[PDB]
Design a protein around this ligand. Structure first.
Ligand SMILES: O=[N+]([O-])c1ccc(O[C@H]2O[C@H](CO)[C@@H](O)[C@H](O)[C@H]2O)cc1
Ligand SMILES: [Mg+2]
Length: 555
């Protein structure tokens, strides 16, 4: 019974969490000051997105030194004090591990690029131009364009699956794996409690490097032939030595692989995120296109991941939000009239699944997309570039702004709204990204003083996971699969059940318990609800707009 199984993790994006220095950028001291808040929310893990030394060409995911902290966030002494104060409050700390690639400003790369005969050359993935002048493969970077960048001085291309200054490490090379493990030991011995492993499932490449005539080439590196071998080796060398938690962030992976990644017998990872439920509103897999989410598909994806991982002995990391996705109230809830109720409903819908839940900073306040209506308010380079291109293509300003409001990666990066003071109390200076005007109504101080707040609903869900074992051990059973508005399911235990009923829309609808649900001899009590208007009988009743109810059934 490992500590991570009943944990709730709070995801912090430090640059937007809390500025204590006045430069408008969040810092580690700001995190320390907020530990009591995190503890009050009843999270027992904190996860920091990358804070390592980095040129910042790619939001910190381009690391030039894994052993030091980007100066703006604070000092190593600050970090060590964060670990000490977190641990004092019973809070564990996990870091972001980004080892598929490094910055091309990393010393290994600078050495490696300098000549084909340099000691570090094989730390990266180098290939010759094809005789026909083509790049070594037709693979595409996830940033667009070719995944190979030519280096004139040495006469070869290096592989970058991501941005140009993010060079893929050569995991075929034992020296590299060894270096990475040494670095992980450094952080564990400092006392951190685990890692999120960034796109870890793309580290094994097909060493034949064939062309892809059926896609962009991801089938030659996604969940590749040695990934499970590398993860298990990583587990033997590192993770097995500490009381650790590891969560792998898998890029377009499959359920069968994730079962293998997370089954305790594999000795690979503890849990994984997948992103399938967060592609439910992409029409034709077009990531920037507007569309309504496909509810039935959403329910099918969630259910499949619950039942198959449960069956296979895998473990899911449960989440709606991160620094790259729209805030969920705005995306799948109603950030208008039903902001509070729909935010509570969304939290319940996911937290009553089997898995380890993750809360993204500000999600517990029901923070919304900021709805910035002028390009001068945006920051992310992909947003600025998309605006520039759509403008040149003649799209009216208002239509471009509507796209950015739905899709900009800036949207979940606005500063956490602490209070009703200037810039919501995030900073005394000028924030690196603006705070939208809702902050006067949406902020921690307000939520903390409202017993009916989204915050306290999350706190209660968090404590429930510690109080009721069935949340962890019960199976999952989808019901009302084809219902156009309700997401309802059971968690089945030993003479004990949870019945979870969520209205995903703002209309009234009928719930009726299916005949094949056997609850003879079971007594019902409300475990948690977002509405005091409770049905006389849960077996058939009219569900209110965005109503969410969980019943504890015991025999
Ligand atoms: O510049 N960036 O910060 C950046 C870099 C890459 C990126 O795409 C992808 O690869 C990342 C690995 O780095 C993962 O973190 C992320 O989950 C995934 O979507 C998104 C943003
Ligand atoms: Mg600061």
């Amino acid at each position: 019974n490992p500590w991570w199984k009943k944990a709730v993790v709070y995801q912090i994006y430090p640059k937007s969490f809390k500025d204590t220095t006045g430069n408008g950028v969040g810092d580690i001291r700001g995190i320390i000051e907020k530990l009591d808040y995190i503890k009050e929310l009843a999270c027992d893990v904190i996860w920091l997105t990358p804070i390592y030394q980095s040129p910042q060409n790619d939001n910190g995911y381009d690391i030039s030194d894994y052993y030091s902290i980007h100066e703006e966030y604070g000092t190593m002494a600050d970090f060590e004090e964060l670990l000490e104060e977190a641990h004092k409050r019973g809070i564990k700390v996990i870091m972001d591990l980004v080892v598929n690639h490094t910055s091309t400003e990393h010393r290994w790369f600078k050495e490696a690029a300098s000549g084909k005969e340099n000691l570090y050359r094989d730390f990266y993935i180098w290939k010759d131009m094809k005789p026909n002048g083509a790049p070594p493969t037709n693979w595409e970077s996830k940033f667009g364009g070719s995944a190979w960048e030519f280096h004139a001085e040495s006469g070869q291309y290096y592989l970058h699956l991501y941005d140009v200054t993010q060079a893929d490490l050569n995991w075929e090379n034992e020296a590299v794996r060894k270096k990475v493990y040494e670095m992980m030991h450094f952080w564990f011995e400092k006392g951190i409690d685990g890692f999120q492993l960034d796109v870890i499932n793309v580290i094994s490449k097909d060493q034949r490097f064939p062309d892809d005539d059926e896609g962009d080439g991801r089938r030659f590196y996604t969940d590749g032939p040695r990934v499970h071998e590398f993860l298990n080796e990583m587990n033997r060398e590192v993770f097995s030595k500490y009381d650790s938690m590891t969560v792998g962030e898998m890029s377009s992976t499959t359920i069968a692989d994730c079962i293998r990644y997370t089954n305790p017998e594999s000795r690979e990872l503890d849990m994984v995120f997948n992103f399938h439920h967060l592609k439910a509103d992409y029409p034709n897999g077009e990531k920037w296109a507007l569309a309504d989410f496909d509810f039935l598909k959403l329910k099918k994806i969630l259910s499949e991941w619950q039942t198959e991982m449960n069956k296979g002995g895998g473990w899911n990391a449960l989440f709606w939000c991160n620094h790259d996705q729209p805030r969920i109230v705005s995306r799948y809830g109603d950030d208008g009239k039903y902001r509070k109720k729909s935010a509570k409903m969304l939290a319940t819908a996911i937290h009553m699944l089997q898995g380890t839940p993750y809360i993204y900073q500000g999600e517990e306040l029901g923070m919304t997309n900021p709805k910035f209506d002028d390009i001068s308010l945006y920051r992310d380079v992909e947003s600025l570039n998309m605006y520039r291109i759509l403008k040149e293509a003649g799209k009216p300003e208002a239509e471009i702004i509507e796209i950015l409001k739905a899709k900009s990666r800036d949207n979940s990066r606005t500063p956490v709204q602490w209070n009703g003071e200037e810039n919501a109390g995030f900073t005394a200076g000028t924030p690196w990204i603006p705070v939208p005007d809702n902050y006067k109504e949406i902020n921690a101080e307000e939520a903390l003083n409202d017993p009916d707040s989204i915050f306290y609903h999350y706190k209660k869900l968090n404590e429930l996971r510690k109080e009721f074992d069935i949340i962890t051990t019960g199976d999952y059973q989808l019901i009302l699969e084809d219902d156009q508005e309700l997401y309802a399911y059971l968690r089945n235990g030993a003479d004990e059940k949870l019945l979870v009923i969520n209205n995903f829309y703002g209309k009234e609808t009928e719930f009726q318990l299916p005949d094949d649900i056997d609850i003879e001899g079971y007594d019902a009590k409300v475990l948690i609800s977002n509405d005091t208007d409770l049905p006389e009988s849960f077996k058939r009743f009219t569900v209110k707009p965005y109503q969410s109810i969980v019943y504890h059934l015991a025999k």
